Every structure is written in structure tokens, then in C-alpha cells.
Amino acid sequence: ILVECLLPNGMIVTLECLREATLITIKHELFKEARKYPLHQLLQDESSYIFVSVTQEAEREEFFDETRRLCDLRLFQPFLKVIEPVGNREEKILNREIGFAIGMPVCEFDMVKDPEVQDFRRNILNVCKEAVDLRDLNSPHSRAMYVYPPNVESSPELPKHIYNKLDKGQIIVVIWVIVSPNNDKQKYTLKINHDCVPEQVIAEAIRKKTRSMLLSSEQCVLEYQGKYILKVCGCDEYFLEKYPLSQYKYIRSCIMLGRMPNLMLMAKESLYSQLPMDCFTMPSYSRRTKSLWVINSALRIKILCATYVNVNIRDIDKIYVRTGIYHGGEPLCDNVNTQRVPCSNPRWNEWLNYDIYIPDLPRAARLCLSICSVKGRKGAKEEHCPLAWGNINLFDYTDTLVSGKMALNLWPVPHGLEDLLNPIGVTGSNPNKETPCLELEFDWFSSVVKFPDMSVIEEHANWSVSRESNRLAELRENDKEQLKAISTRDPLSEITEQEKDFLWSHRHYCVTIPEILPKLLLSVKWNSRDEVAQMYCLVKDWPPIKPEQAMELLDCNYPDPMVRGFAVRCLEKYLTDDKLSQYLIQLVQVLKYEQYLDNLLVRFLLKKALTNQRIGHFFFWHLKSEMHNKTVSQRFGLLLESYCRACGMYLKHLNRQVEAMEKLINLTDILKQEKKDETQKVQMKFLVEQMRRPDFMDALQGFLSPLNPAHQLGNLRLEECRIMSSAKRPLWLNWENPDIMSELLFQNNEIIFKNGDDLRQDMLTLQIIRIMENIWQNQGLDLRMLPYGCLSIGDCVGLIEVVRNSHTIMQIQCKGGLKGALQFNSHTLHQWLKDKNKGEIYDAAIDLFTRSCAGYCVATFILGIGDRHNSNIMVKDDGQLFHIDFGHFLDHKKKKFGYKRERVPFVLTQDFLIVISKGAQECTKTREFERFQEMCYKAYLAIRQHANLFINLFSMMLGSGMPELQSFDDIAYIRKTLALDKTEQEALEYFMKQMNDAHHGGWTT
Amino acid sequence: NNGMNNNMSLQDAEWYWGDISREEVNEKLRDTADGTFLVRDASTKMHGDYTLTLRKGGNNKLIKIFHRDGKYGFSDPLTFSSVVELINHYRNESLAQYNPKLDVKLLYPVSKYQQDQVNIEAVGKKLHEYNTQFQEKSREYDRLYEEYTRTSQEIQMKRTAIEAFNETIKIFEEQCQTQERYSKEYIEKFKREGNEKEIQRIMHNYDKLKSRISEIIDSRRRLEEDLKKQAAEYREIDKRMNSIKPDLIQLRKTRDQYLMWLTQKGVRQKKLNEWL
């Protein structure tokens, strides 16, 4: 490459440098040819200089790491400048690694003048300190505990339906001891109780080993050596904690499937040396009046002008600014509009007046506003359409009321949004300056105005009752029943004014029913000072509640900091690691509902992600997948920078995964755009040419799988990598497993790379399916679902786990002959199931098929996923059936094309019924069919009994950006599909009627 | 009125709406004045319950009507013979009597007769026309959105390229400054030895640096002009969407109104959904 080089003496030299050349060679040959040019004697020594240049990301990144290659620098232009080092080398090396991991440079954080951002950067380091220090407290044990956390479940108690799978409460395990003189491996079958801790398992394994190994006659103290640990064969899972063996996820899954639990006996010191020290250091940037309740004036905000709006003068007549004071999604007063002005001169200079006093403003009060246009004209006038929107916190992060001039840059209206205002949306100005900007003025009250401290608020309570129709103040039993009845209601139930007044009038007895707190919080008028003070006094001493219900308090309906702090404390004291892992997506999503960067929830999440690497991996990937969206780019970037600073040497693995995903993204973007007008074979030849280069091979081999960090992806098998002919241009990639004994788990790991389709809907659907399966298995129903792995890594790009030995129904019906009008006898599925397993395993195959089919029928009907055909449903060899390619949910394909109420997505065709009825010509009148119907009914009722959790989980993704989830009206679909307003009997009847109306079969009792 | 008594039954009442959900009530009450009300059946489907939705303070307040021994009331005691009598009593007297904090009266009914201002074959053909226009406007709209998103991505890339050009030109200008500073004490050396060729090969490098920095400035200027043009197109696309949106919304509302009117008339949906 014709790189032109800049020497410090004004010397300019052209140096021909190879693309695969390290910076050491570049420096050496740069000073080698620096002798034939003018002023060479004045040049200093070669080792006292470094390379600085500009990258494609528009920063001047000094090249303190000379081991990098020329192409990896991402140069904007092929040039290098020779300078002298001025700062700390390792700090900038770490900063560059963080910048690569994050997707944007660290320095542009330092170039931010918002005091909140710098305060967050300085203050999150304390949590980083505590996490890193706790991780190092008991080295080397705590370090391995952090790197390889136990994959256990919440409770050691064993469900009764699988305790009977045990042989008298005992487990068969196969322990593999790799003595390896060269490679030799042995096995030891053992019989132990399900509740033994791994120390006892190791003790019994060594007892078996020290009985017949290298001796057959008698000759520390032969028991409890303590020098070994347990490892799952074929993957990076370890049993390092004192838990019952059945509590580990791998063991209990083996019990579920009746498989053979394979384990290994590694040495303690080998694993301890397998992981390095964490050298975490603080960076450079760590080196560093009247109350609101004394202002007797109604709130008013001036709207000065707007710089520009993008409308046409021949279509839009006039424009106006519509404002409103909100607490969450609930207005605190009526909305106020400005006057109507022509679009050419958007100047108002108007003092808007609001119907709320200043001391009555809640701490989380926000001003929401939008520029809107009025079409009008003709008889049907008043056609309003918003153009831009924005929200401002009326208090800053230091509890100070806004004052003075303020310039706000607004955001584009989200797709499929009709309401004039957008209170759900995030706060803050648009970082882009080529946007409509609205100038506002706030009142100046001769000093700085602060929200009152908790002490004076507590003073206000216990006094408000003295001054002052059953509110504003031994409790009858008919009231007690009413409180419980309200408590059992779903969070999106109808709450009447009478019910709200009843709840508030009995707030001092609501404490004995701790689960009623969300309703009581929705029953207080947040525009009243004394009511909020009393609510604060109640929340201060509220009994703890379950994480299931405390998570509900973190959605957009409860913006008050005290309520969110109570919810975060409940999460701190009750939420387990596996439950946190199951619910991490929603907890990440509800970070956007926080008004300030430094909050208790972000501290709790970062502390958890720095003490548990499994949690931290998905934390990083969930934050990184939505760095493209500018509404959350800064907050997520700051949080991710802190995490990457304090994570340790997991940053190298994360960096490797980022390079792999970037190379895959570039390849898919090339083949999906330049090769639209091409056949698949030439694309495949091109693609194997692309993997032929050593650079892409090195980038795509030897890194941890983002879907499961415990899985290592070794070399790429190019003979088994292909481009699918399905929708978009997905990539089938096959990796070898570098584990010593991959044959026990799986030899090959296969992942689909999809570029073009959103995967957040699929991720949410699979999470819901996994939760449904867990509820069913705990209830006593063995409905086995297959919630395969799916991860979104960026904007419309993600990874999908592949299930081996699976075929679509179309694949079977095509491989079994017949075509088109030839009905395949509707027996091809049953014939294939008979063929692929025969004998005594046949009955188990139909049993598994029936249970999985029932589970998926109930789940698909409840979630309202897109219509199912023979190409998005797959069945394994053993009989298990599962759905793929979820796409949409809650209809959302209908509701715009028409009415299409409560459609059944997965209708049982005849082909499935003959499988369930085991070859019976008539299927609906058999005992198998009614057993299947009973299983479906029980699954539906079991899910209905846990409707609150599903409603709450759906309510946390409202601000995520999925078009299916923009308001609670979208969750009304779930509310009505479970018949939540009806009672249990009519809900069961409604489900049977729904199944009848799509089958015309025997779905009536 | 006309009957001046309870003779206006529940079906005859303009404010009673029968079987509607929360979503439709919220749609009808959106951004309405204080005192806008409509009465619907209770969502739990028991006969004679009824629920009243009232607009106050920008929020939809839900008030439940009770029904015991043929009487109706907002709470105990129940003193009204029907719900028409209670709704009229609170249309003429403020609701602050029932509870002081609801200082509002029942002002503005949401009439179910007001939607009839705008022959099954004829209405079916009209629905087909409206649906066709809606589909055309919708495909125009989302192709505009795709164009707009791609334009925004190009604009962001070109802005980043502008910043990179600025950094590169600054670096080259500091290099020129360093060359000028270093030329002070060393340029007078090749005037005693009689070798002006050394000064010539000195000036060669400076001329090359000046040519390179001028070329970089030219590239930056060209890319800035392209950025200006692309931002102009971005504004034009935003204007065109702003024009497209309200007519599309109104046309969708008209199509939905026609579909609802035709569906309630008594036709099976098989004949309607076949034509999409």
C-alpha cells in the first residue's frame, strides 16, 4: 500500500508497506529509508517514537500497540505520523480495546460536556471497585467462581414427577478420568443419591478409582483428596459450589431426558492456572437554594420558536405546539396547546399556563411536547398529525428544578404512532443537530429550586391527617375480601374510581396484603403533595414482595424513585442468579425508563454482571445489540464502557466475538447486495472464496459462541458451510468442538447467521415458551418444549441455534414421495415416525409427540403467533415437535387488514391427528385424542393461573421499539386470549369453543 | 329533548354504546374536552352492570354503575330507576355531589348516531375502493420510510467522513508548521558549500506536502457538497411523508368505519374477507 509517512522533522517519505505487516516492521523500514531524504541527521532514535493516524471512525488513535497489523487499524487514509509518547501506554491500549468492543471510541465520551455524563463516569467506578474487590477476595477460588459460575436452579427441592424417574432417589453417572499417558481415558459408573454435593461425588469416584486401578490387593489418607473438581464433558461447565448434584442444570436436564450424565475429573491447579489475574485500574477521568414547597405560583412554560419544520405550505395549513405535564404515562393535568401559526414563521412567544401548582409537582414529573400540524378544511375538519416530539425532566439528576432558556432538539415520530404526544419515549435532546429545535423558557424564582429532602417530606406526613368521604384518616371482614379480590386482579385490569378511593381509604391495612402495592400506587393522585408524602411513608416500611411482582414496579407506570428503589431492593434480596439470567432482557429494557443515568437499577445490574461472567456476557450483548438506536446510544455506551473497564480478560473473548460477527456481517452484506441478480451456486463459490482467505479464517475460528459462552467454536468446516435458499440470505456455519471429549456431548456446533430480519420478537417468544415449559413441568405436566437459542447482536442481525436431527414437515412429505393434489395419504408423518423408531420406543415416540404438540398448541394460541404451515414446524427423530420462524405475535398481521378476532395460529391438521391417534382412520373419537384434549385444557389453565407474570413481562418491552408492542392495547390481546375478565369455568369453555371453531371436531364436552 | 322522560330506552340513548372494549372507548375519548362521556356494558359480561367512562384532567375515569332490586346508582344507596335517569341527573347536576374531587358535569355525549353521516353490492364496492386506496398509500408510505432510513444512514456516514477529513487536514497542517519551524536553523547551511541542489531537494518535499494537503482539502470540499445535497433530499423525503401521513390516516378511518357498518349490518365475513 502506497502509505505516505510524516516524520517529526517535517520530513515526508513514501514507504511501501505490506498489508500483513506489523507496526514494528513499519517503524524499522520507515527509519531505514529516512536517510535519503533531507534533514536525516537531526532524527532521533527509532525506539523513542510512536505512530499516530486517523481512523475511519474519525479519531486520532495513537498506535501504542505495535503488534497489530496495518489493515487492522481501520485507517481513513493510508498515512502515518511519527510523534513522541506523552501518556500512559497501557491505559490507551485498554481504551482502544474497549473502543473496538463497544463500536465507538472512548474519547468521544470525554468530549461530552454534560455534567451528568461525567458524574456517571466518575461515580460508577465505586461499584466497579466493590465488584472487582469481592471477585478477588478468596483467590484463586473466587476468580474461578466468577469465570465459571454454577449453572444451578433456584430451589433444591425436586419436582415429584421427576423424582420418580430416579431409581429409589439415586442417580447413575459416568465419571471420565483422563490419566492421559498419551491420550488414554477411562470411565467409572457410579450410583449416588441425587442430593450429594460434588465433594461426595468426587470422594466416591476416587474410592472406585483407588480400588481397582494399578492394583488388586491391599498394600490424603486414601479419602477426600480435595485436589480435583468436576467438569461437564464436551463443554466449559464446572461444579465449583456446594450444591446438591440434582440442582445443577445439566444433571436435572439429564434426569428430564433420561440421558447419561457424563462428567470429568480435572485437577484444581490446572483450572486455577487456566485463568489469569485481573489488573483493573482507574483511568484518567477519576481524578476528581430554596425548597420547592415555598413557591406559590402555578407552573408556566414559554414556547419561544422553532428553527424549522418539514411540512409543505400547499398541504399543511397551520402548526402548533402541544404540551403536557406527565407522571409516567398519566398526565398530571390537562394538555395545553399554543396558538395556530403559519408553517413559514414558527414563532409563538407564548406563556403557556398549566393547572398544577409548583409544590404539587412529583419528583419524576416530565414535560412532554410535540410539534403538530392541523389540516382542517371542508366539513370534516380537524385532521391532526404530529411531526416531532420531545420530553424533558422537570428536575435534574441533582434534584434541581429546571430554569432559564433551554434548546431542545426533537425526535422523529415512531412508525405506527397516532397520539400527538409520546410520553413513553425517552428524555433528552436529539444528538443530531440537523433536526427541528424548540426554544423554551422556564421561570426564574430568584434562586435555585430543589426538591425537598426525605426528612421534611416525612415531616409533612404525620401532620397532613391533623388538618383533615372515607379517605383522609378494626376493619370489617367484607372489606378484607375486597382487598384480596383486587389483589388477585391482573396488572392491566379495569380499576374504577370507587375502587381507587376504597384502596386509598384502606392504605393502612393494605400492608398486611403486600402484593396489592401496584394497585395502591396506581390509586394515589400523584399531583397531590400530601398524598405522595403519605405514600412515601408507607413505602418506607413496606413488607418485601416477590421478584415476580417487584419487577412490575420497574415498568413505565411507576416512575417515582422511591418505588423503583424498593423494587430494586426486592430484586437485590430475593432474585437468584438463574432467575436474573431468565429475566435479563426485560431488566435491560427497563433501563430506558429511568430518567437519570445513575440509578439503583443500573448499579444492581452492573454489580451482578461483574460478579457473574455468564450474566455479564448476555449483559454486554443485549446492550451492544441496540447501540445503533440513537435514543439509548449514550447511556448504553457509558454503561458498556464501565463494564468493559471492570470485566477483566473476558474483554479479549468479547473482542474476538465482535471481530467474528463483524466479518460475518460484512460478508452477508456483500452477498445480499452485490449478488441479488445471481444464482445460488456462484454465490456459494464466492462464499467459499471468502472463507479461503487466512484473515477471515483466523477471525472466524477459535472463539466462544455468543449463543452459549460455555461452548467453544473451533475450526470452520468449509465442506459443511452453505448459503440457504430460504428467506433473506442466511448462513449455515459448522464449527468443530475443540473439547477433548466432544463425542459425549456433540462433535459439531451449528449456528445460523441471519442478516436482515429482526430477532427481538423471536427472542421474546422463545423466552416465553421456556417460562411456559418451566411452569408446566413444575405443575406436573410433562409438556416438553424446545426453546432453542436465539440472540440479537445488532440491527436486524443475529444468531440462531440449530437443532440436530430435525426436519420440517414439508421435508418429510417431500422425501416420502407424492406431490400436490396427492394428499400423501396424510399418513406420511406417522409412517416416518414408525420407521425412524420401532419396537417399545414407538409408544414413547407418540407420547412425546402428543405432549409437545399439546404444549405448542396452547402456547401458540395464547401468544397469537403468525400462522403455521409445513415449513416453520419441525419434528425430531424421537418424536418431539417444535416451531421455528416465529416472526410476529399478538397478530399484528391482522388488526390492520380487518377484524380477524382471536385466530388460532396452530390448527391441528389431520396429518397430526393420525399421529396422535396412532393410525386410527377416525381420530377425534379415540381415547388418545381425549387424553390430548385434557392435556391441552390443563396446560391452558396452568398458564392462566400465572397470567400476571406474562402480562408484566410483556409490559416491559413497550419502549423496546418492537412494532408489536407500543402500548397496553397490544397486551390486551394476551388479556383477552386468557379470558382474564371471565371466570375459570367460562375461560375453559371459551378455550374449548376456540378449539372447536378452528377444527369442527370433537372439542366439546 | 323529545320524550321528556325515561321513554328513551337504553337502545335509544345516544350515549349508550353496548358492547365495546377499553381500547375503542379510549380511541373515542382521545384528546376530548372535559365532560365527554359514554356508557358501555361492563367488561366482565354480566347483565345490567354497565360502566361509565368520563373525561377529566386528560384521563379517562371509569365509574361503575350498580344494580340491585331494580335500582341503579354509583354507590350505596341506589336511588335511580334506570341508568337513563341517573345519567340525566348527572347531566343536569355536577358529579361533585357524589364525590367532591370530581368537580365536573356530564357535558358531551359520544353519539352513536354521529357516525352515520358517511345495496350490499354498492357498499362492498365502496369498501373495495377504499381498501385499494389504503393499500396504495401504505406501500407508498413504507417505501418512503425505507428510502428515508437509507438516506439517514448515508448522511451519518458522510458526517463521520467529514470529521475524519478535518482531523487529517489538521494533522497535515501541524506537520507543515513543524517543517516551517525546523527550516529556521538548517536552511542556511547549503549556502556556503555551494550546493543549492540540497535546498532544491529540501523544497521538493515541502511542495509534495502542500500538493497532498491541497488534494485532501479538495476531496473534503467535494464530499461536503455531496452532504449538502443529500441533506436537502432528506428534508424533501421528510416533507413528502408529512404530506402523506394525514390523508392515509383519514382514509384508514373511513375504510374501518365502512367495514364496521357493513359487519354490524348482518353479513357473514366470508363474503367480505375473500376480496380483502
Swiss-Prot record, chain A:
Renumbered residue ranges of the record's region Activation loop: 883-909
Site residues (Implicated in the recognition of ATP as well as PIP2. Also crucial for autophosphorylation of the p85alpha subunit), renumbered to this chain: 728
EC class of the enzyme, as a word: transferase
Effect on the protein upon substituting residue 497 to G: In KERSEB; also found in an endometrial carcinoma sample
Pfam families assigned to the protein according to its UniProt record, in alphabetical order: PI3_PI4_kinase (PF00454), PI3K_C2 (PF00792), PI3K_p85B (PF02192), PI3K_rbd (PF00794), PI3Ka (PF00613)
Gene Ontology cellular component terms for the protein in this record: cytoplasm; cytosol; intercalated disc; lamellipodium; perinuclear region of cytoplasm; phosphatidylinositol 3-kinase complex; phosphatidylinositol 3-kinase complex, class IA; phosphatidylinositol 3-kinase complex, class IB
Reported effect, residue 498 to P: Found in an anaplastic astrocytoma sample; uncertain significance
Consequence recorded when altering residue 69 to Q: In MCAP; also found in a glioblastoma multiforme sample
Effect of residue 494 to V: In BC; uncertain significance
Listed InterPro entries: ARM-type_fold (IPR016024), C2_domain_sf (IPR035892), Kinase-like_dom_sf (IPR011009), PI3/4_kinase_cat_dom (IPR000403), PI3/4_kinase_cat_sf (IPR036940), PI3/4_kinase_CS (IPR018936), PI3K-type_C2_dom (IPR002420), PI3K_ABD (IPR003113)
Effect seen on changing residue 973 to N: Found in a glioblastoma multiforme sample; uncertain significance
Effect noted on mutating residue 999 to L: In BC, CLAPO, MADAC and CCM4; somatic mutation
Recorded consequence of changing residue 999 to R: In CLOVE, KERSEB, CRC, BC, OC, MADAC, CCM4 and HFMH; also found in an endometrial carcinoma sample; somatic mutation; shows an increase in lipid kinase activity; oncogenic in vivo; requires binding to p85 regulatory subunit to induce cellular transformation but not interaction with RAS; may mimic the conformatitonal change triggered by the interaction with RAS; enhances invadopodia-mediated extracellular matrix degradation and invasion in breast cancer cells; may alter the interaction of the PI3K/PI4K kinase domain with the cell membrane; increased AKT and RPS6 phosphorylation in HFMH patient's cell
Residue intervals of the PI3K-ABD domain: 1-86
Molecular function (Gene Ontology), one example: protein kinase activator activity
Residue ranges of every copy of the PI3K-RBD domain listed in the record: 168-267
GO biological process: actin cytoskeleton organization; adipose tissue development; angiogenesis; anoikis; autosome genomic imprinting; cardiac muscle cell contraction; cardiac muscle contraction; cell migration
Effect listed in the UniProt record for changing residue 987 to V: In MCAP; also found in an endometrial carcinoma sample
E.C. no: 2.7.1.137, 2.7.1.153, 2.7.11.1
Effect of residue 19 to H: In CRC; likely involved in disease pathogenesis; shows an increase in lipid kinase activity; may disrupt the interaction between the PI3K-ABD domain and the N-terminal lobe of PI3K/PI4K kinase domain possibly affecting the conformation of the kinase domain
Note: The avian sarcoma virus 16 genome encodes an oncogene derived from PIK3CA.
Name of this chain's protein: Phosphatidylinositol 4,5-bisphosphate 3-kinase catalytic subunit alpha isoform
From Swiss-Prot, chain B:
Molecular function via GO: 1-phosphatidylinositol-3-kinase regulator activity; enzyme-substrate adaptor activity; ErbB-3 class receptor binding; insulin binding; insulin receptor binding; insulin receptor substrate binding; insulin-like growth factor receptor binding; kinase activator activity
Record carries keyword Cytoplasm: no
Modified residues (Phosphotyrosine): 145, 258
PTM remark: Polyubiquitinated in T-cells by CBLB; which does not promote proteasomal degradation but impairs association with CD28 and CD3Z upon T-cell activation. In adipose tissue, polyubiquitinated by the BCR(KBTBD2) E3 ubiquitin ligase complex; recognized by KBTBD2 through the SH2 domains, undergoes 'Lys-48'-linked polyubiquitination leading to its degradation.
The entry's keywords: Acetylation, Disease variant, Dwarfism, GTPase activation, Host-virus interaction, Phosphoprotein, Protein transport, Repeat, SH2 domain, SH3 domain, Stress response, Transport, Ubl conjugation
Tissue: Isoform 2 is expressed in skeletal muscle and brain, and at lower levels in kidney and cardiac muscle. Isoform 2 and isoform 4 are present in skeletal muscle (at protein level).
Domain of life: Eukaryota
GO cellular component, one term: phosphatidylinositol 3-kinase complex
UniProt keyword Nucleus, yes or no: no
Domain SH2, residue spans: 15-110
GO BP, sorted A to Z: B cell differentiation; cellular response to insulin stimulus; cellular response to UV; cytokine-mediated signaling pathway; extrinsic apoptotic signaling pathway via death domain receptors; growth hormone receptor signaling pathway; immune response; insulin receptor signaling pathway
Reported effect, residue 167 to K: In SHORTS; there is 70 to 90% reduction in the effect of insulin on AKT1 activation, glycogen synthesis and glucose uptake, indicating severe insulin resistance for both proximal and distal PI3K-dependent signaling
Annotated family: Belongs to the PI3K p85 subunit family.
Function of the protein: Binds to activated (phosphorylated) protein-Tyr kinases, through its SH2 domain, and acts as an adapter, mediating the association of the p110 catalytic unit to the plasma membrane. Necessary for the insulin-stimulated increase in glucose uptake and glycogen synthesis in insulin-sensitive tissues. Plays an important role in signaling in response to FGFR1, FGFR2, FGFR3, FGFR4, KITLG/SCF, KIT, PDGFRA and PDGFRB. Likewise, plays a role in ITGB2 signaling.
Domain writeup: The SH3 domain mediates the binding to CBLB, and to HIV-1 Nef.
Recorded disease: Agammaglobulinemia 7, autosomal recessive: A primary immunodeficiency characterized by profoundly low or absent serum antibodies and low or absent circulating B-cells due to an early block of B-cell development. Affected individuals develop severe infections in the first years of life.
Designated name of the protein: Phosphatidylinositol 3-kinase regulatory subunit alpha
Species this chain originates from: Homo sapiens (Human)
